[PDB]
RNA sequence: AAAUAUGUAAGAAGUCCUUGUUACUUAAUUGAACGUGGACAUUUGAAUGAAGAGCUUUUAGUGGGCCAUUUUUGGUAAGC
RNA sequence: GGAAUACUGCCAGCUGGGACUGAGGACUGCGACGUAAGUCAAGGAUGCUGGCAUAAUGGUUAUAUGCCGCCCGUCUUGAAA
């Protein structure tokens, strides 16, 4: 029973399988990602040709950054924010976009800044700040086979799945979603950009829908 | 001296209505309950009999008794920092069905139904609710609608 | 700051490491906090909990409750196992053949178990009869028959017996107890 | 801020009982996109039954100059409140975009009047188109023909805090 | 001397510190407050239940 | 014992993500996309222009 | 006749099929209540979160409060 | 009519300067580059060199300087009063 090689490399060729199959998918991924954009800039073009106008889709994902401190805030409000896991200054969550989240928001409006999250934004959080909730604690993801054992239930083997499943809002969102460590970022490194946060953004502040300003903010943020 | 009396400050709520005034109609009394029916509490100032108390008005209750003109109706009333059930007889006449159970009822029947058709068949059953979606995308002509462009108006003074 | 949505540092509020300093105690609490870590039996890591626990919370167990018991169908050659001490009962005239481990039996309750032909069994001797607690079944004694939880919860219109030393007529058997004086509770 | 001009055109949400409405359409002045969409709500609000809940926006798009290199004489009403009441004035301003004359347009407001944003509307800004009919002396001065003028004090802008001679004002 | 009369001030934070908990549901609500006359047939029909289940499954 | 940041930490990049070879290697982050000669209508280029 | 606040419901302790008991009820196996057997399982019946959920005993201090935004009473008003 | 450029955005594009940190202590894991042996920036710093080897670093203490610091205890809604 030498037991360092055989085993080992069994292991080993299981890996290697587990890795094709995460390089197809992420191949898979990418490929998909470009139709749906140029699908999308395809179908602008076509209907300013036509005469008409194209009404892009209304967005299924945003990007929610408390913003204010924990103190003297309304209940209503505080018990939302400890809803949606924003119980920290600078803390992010992604939210599902329904009517009954869209009325959560609206509640907490004064003191988030959200938006609407790219690609590049998401991998980036992921990447970066990216920690799974196993048993009750903060794991720092960096490895597949922690997304493996945790989410592996619901097909998602890899980071990219992760990813993937966050920015496509697919069968398994809330899952990925809750198993996503609320995401810890510093303040900004530009600064804000106003002179004064708590305002809408539409009067000059920091609160509220910033569409995909949003992208900006929390790339300096992270 | 200060006067909390039972029916203290109910000026408005025990109010008949507009033009309803007078005798009760017979379907109030030709309506049948069993227990465990879900019933709404809404007093009527013409019938003095069995009266629910001012707390009561607008609260939704299940029926435990039942007896000759009355019916005995449970409400979980909030007191300090707990619930406290509370069981009052009231007359039918301060006593009406409920309308929301019967709602998620024939939601169960159309459920049940549209899951047994789809049990032949296996097509993705799909049989929870979902809330209102973010709306797809779309495409919006100009034929005959070409846009027209307004502008704020000027001040003035319309006396 | 963190805006908390639970007490911070609160203690789990479950007992580990029984409170009494017996050394034979702690000897079975060793033994079978490895059979619960290394063992996989649910029935190791209950008799480990119920070791810790105080006197109040480990009622005597009767050979007439084991008796009782062991009539269930299909629960005759079973292993009792009380994590406490077995008392006897007179009130019973015939006994079974069984085995019951326990931590402590009572002379009677030896001498009963070892006439009716079966045995007297220590935890650590459970330990290598039936380490994963094979075809065992635990007997637990009456919480709420001592003369304490009497009083518990004391109220009008509870019921619930009055903290006394004497008793008798004219100990609190008049005015808040009848309607002949006063009201009746 | 800097301003931007956007098309904003917006309906009211399809029903059954109508499909197809109407499709208004606004020119707003906005820093971004999200201001120009909360101002085009904004002043539809004041003049159709509608809000955001019950409509669409189905296109915003920038609109450039269409000569940024050739100067304008523009033309711009307002309304504007007060601490008082509601006015309307009529303005002019030289100047060589439609962004910088807005832009230079809330500058003076603010300054001669103390009208914040959320106090001015511009009712329109239009290019006039022949001169003589140039109403306003503070920009009718410079259509003279073979115009020039000097700058006098001219006041150099020092890099030290010691300069070591005396400095000229000449220009 | 006067004094304050009254407040409501602190009293919903201080219910709801380990507050409003709804109250426990069970199967078989007790029957007490209901009908005698239902009760007393009720138990005879149990009675005769019981009966005739133990004479069904003896 | 130590989080190493992937985008940067190239190793631990090629860990996580086979596919970053690759990306990197036909350098599809910077794409050509094909060309297309549409033009909006006359009814969209007067809307836009419109006073 | 609002806005804000407010009661209930959103399943397995559910729904349907068949039929036993009674001194109650009915003209009447008519009904009422409680019962025996069968069918419908992970999209088991909206969202989001759960940081464990539930239960009990015992006892400290406290039972002069004051301030701010908004609602609001008396007063010309008040750091009333 | 054909371009350019701005603006906005993306790159698992390349590259220069500066600062703070070096926790852990046999091996085990996931990877990368290689046909292989092996190597590596891949589960936390090593290599090379100099001066001193002492009051030099450091500690203690007195003083100076910059900025800060009201009297404790108590009753009280409120104490430097
Ligand atoms: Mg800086
Ligand atoms: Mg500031
Ligand atoms: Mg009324
Ligand atoms: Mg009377
Ligand atoms: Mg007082
Ligand atoms: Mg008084
Ligand atoms: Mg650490
Ligand atoms: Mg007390
Ligand atoms: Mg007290
Ligand atoms: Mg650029
Ligand atoms: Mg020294
Ligand atoms: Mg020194
Ligand atoms: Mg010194
Ligand atoms: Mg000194
Ligand atoms: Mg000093
Ligand atoms: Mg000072
Ligand atoms: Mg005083």
Redesign the pocket.
């Known amino acids: 029973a030498e037991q360092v090689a055989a085993e ?1 490399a069994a ?2 060729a299981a ?1 290697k399988e ?2 094709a199959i995460i390089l197809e998918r ?1 191949a898979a991924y ?1 490929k998909e990602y470009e139709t749906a954009e140029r699908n999308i800039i395809q179908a602008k073009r076509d209907a300013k040709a036509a005469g008409s106008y194209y009404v892009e889709a209304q967005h299924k994902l945003v990007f929610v950054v408390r913003i204010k401190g924990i103190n003297k805030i309304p209940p ?1 409000p505080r018990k939302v924010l ?4 924003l119980t920290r200054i600078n803390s992010g969550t992604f939210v ?1 976009v ?1 009517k ?2 869209l009325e959560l928001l609206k509640l907490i409006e004064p003191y988030v800044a959200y938006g609407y999250p ?1 690609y ?2 998401i ?2 959080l992921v990447y970066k700040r990216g920690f799974g909730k196993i048993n ?1 604690q903060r794991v720092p993801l960096s ?1 597949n ?1 922690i997304i493996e054992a945790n989410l592996g239930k619901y097909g998602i083997l890899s980071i990219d799945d992760l990813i993937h499943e966050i920015i496509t809002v697919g ?1 398994h969102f ?1 899952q990925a ?2 198993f996503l460590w609320p995401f810890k970022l510093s303040n900004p490194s530009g600064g804000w950009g106003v002179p004064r946060k708590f305002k809408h953004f539409i009067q000059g502040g920091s609160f509220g829908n910033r569409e995909e300003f949003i ?2 903010l929390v ?1 300096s943020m992270n | 001296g200060k006067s909390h009396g039972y029916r203290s400050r109910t000026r408005y709520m025990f109010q008949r209505d507009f033009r309803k005034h007078g005798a009760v109609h017979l379907s109030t009394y030709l309506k049948v309950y ?3 029916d ?1 019933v ?1 509490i809404k007093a009527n100032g013409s019938i003095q009999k069995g009266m629910p108390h001012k707390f009561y008005q ?3 209750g299940v029926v435990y008794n039942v007896t000759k003109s009355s019916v005995g109706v449970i409400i ?1 009333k909030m007191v300090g920092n707990r619930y406290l059930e509370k069981r009052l007889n009231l007359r039918v006449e301060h006593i009406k069905h ?1 309308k ?2 019967q709602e ?2 024939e939601r ?2 159309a ?2 139904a549209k ?1 047994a058709e789809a ?1 032949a068949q296996g097509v993705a ?7 209102a979606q973010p709306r797809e995308s779309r495409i919006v002509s100009t034929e005959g609608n070409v846009p027209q462009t307004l502008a704020p108006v000027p001040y003035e003074t319309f006396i | 700051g963190i805006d908390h ?2 007490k911070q540092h609160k203690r ?3 007992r580990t490491a029984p409170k009494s300093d017996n050394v034979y105690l702690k000897l079975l609490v060793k033994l079978y906090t490895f059979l619960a870590r290394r063992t996989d039996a649910p029935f190791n890591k209950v008799v480990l909990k119920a070791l810790f626990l105080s006197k109040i919370n480990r009622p005597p167990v009767s050979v007439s409750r084991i008796a009782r018991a062991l009539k269930q169908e299909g629960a005759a050659n079973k292993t009792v196992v009380v994590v406490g001490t077995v008392t006897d009962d007179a009130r019973i005239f015939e006994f079974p053949k069984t085995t019951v481990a326990a931590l402590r039996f009572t002379a009677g309750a030896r001498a009963k178990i070892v006439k009716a032909g079966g045995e007297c069994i220590t935890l650590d001797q459970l330990a290598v009869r039936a380490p994963k607690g094979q075809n065992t079944l635990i007997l637990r004694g009456p919480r709420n028959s001592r003369e304490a939880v009497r ?3 004391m109220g009008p219109h509870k019921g619930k017996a009055p903290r006394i030393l004497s008793t008798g007529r004219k100990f609190e058997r008049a005015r808040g107890r009848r309607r002949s004086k006063g009201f009746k509770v | 801020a800097h301003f931007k001009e956007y098309q904003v055109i917006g309906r009211r949400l399809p029903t059954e009982s109508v499909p197809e409405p109407k499709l208004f359409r606004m020119r707003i002045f906005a820093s971004n996109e999200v201001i120009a969409k909360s101002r085009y709500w904004y002043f539809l609000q004041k003049l159709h039954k509608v809000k955001k809940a019950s409509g669409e926006i189905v296109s915003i798009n920038q609109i450039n100059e269409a000569h940024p290199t050739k100067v304008k004489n523009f033309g711009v009403w307002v309304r504007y409140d007060s601490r008082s009441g509601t006015h309307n004035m009529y303005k002019e301003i030289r100047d060589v975009s439609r962004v910088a004359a807005v832009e230079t347009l809330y500058q003076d407001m603010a300054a001669r009047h103390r009208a914040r944003f959320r106090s001015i509307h511009i009712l329109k800004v239009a290019e006039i188109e022949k001169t003589a009919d140039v109403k306003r002396q503070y920009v009718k001065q410079f259509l003279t023909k073979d115009l020039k003028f000097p700058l006098p004090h001219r006041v150099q802008k020092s890099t030290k805090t010691f300069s070591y001679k005396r400095p000229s004002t000449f220009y | 001397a006067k ?2 009369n009254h407040t409501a ?1 602190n009293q919903t934070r201080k219910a709801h510190r380990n507050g409003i ?1 709804k109250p ?4 078989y609500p007790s029957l007490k407050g209901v009908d005698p ?2 009760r ?3 138990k ?3 009675h ?2 019981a009966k ?2 133990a004479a069904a499954k003896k | ?2 989080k ?1 940041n992937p ?1 940067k ?1 190239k ?5 996580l ?5 690759v ?2 290697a036909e ?1 599809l ?2 794409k050509k996309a094909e060309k297309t000669g549409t033009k909006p209508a006359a009814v969209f280029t007067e809307t836009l222009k419109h006073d």
Do not use: E, M, W
Not at chain 5, 24 to 27: A, D, F, G, I, V
Not at chain 6, 11 to 15: E, I, K, M, T
């Open positions: 080992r292991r080993k890996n587990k890795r992420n990418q209503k400890q809803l949606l896991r599902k329904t009954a989240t790219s590049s934004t991998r980036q009750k490895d086979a069968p809330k979603n809750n992208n900006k790339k | 069993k227990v465990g879900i709404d607008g609260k939704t979980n409920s929301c159970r998620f009822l169960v029947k459920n049940a899951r049990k059953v799909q049989l929870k609710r979902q809330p | 949505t639970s789990s509020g479950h009083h518990f919860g | 004094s304050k001030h908990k426990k549901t069970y199967k006359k239902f007393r047939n009720h005879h029909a149990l005769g239940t005739a289940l | 014992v130590l190493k985008l930490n190793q631990v990049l090629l860990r993500n086979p596919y970053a070879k990306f990197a350098k982050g910077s």
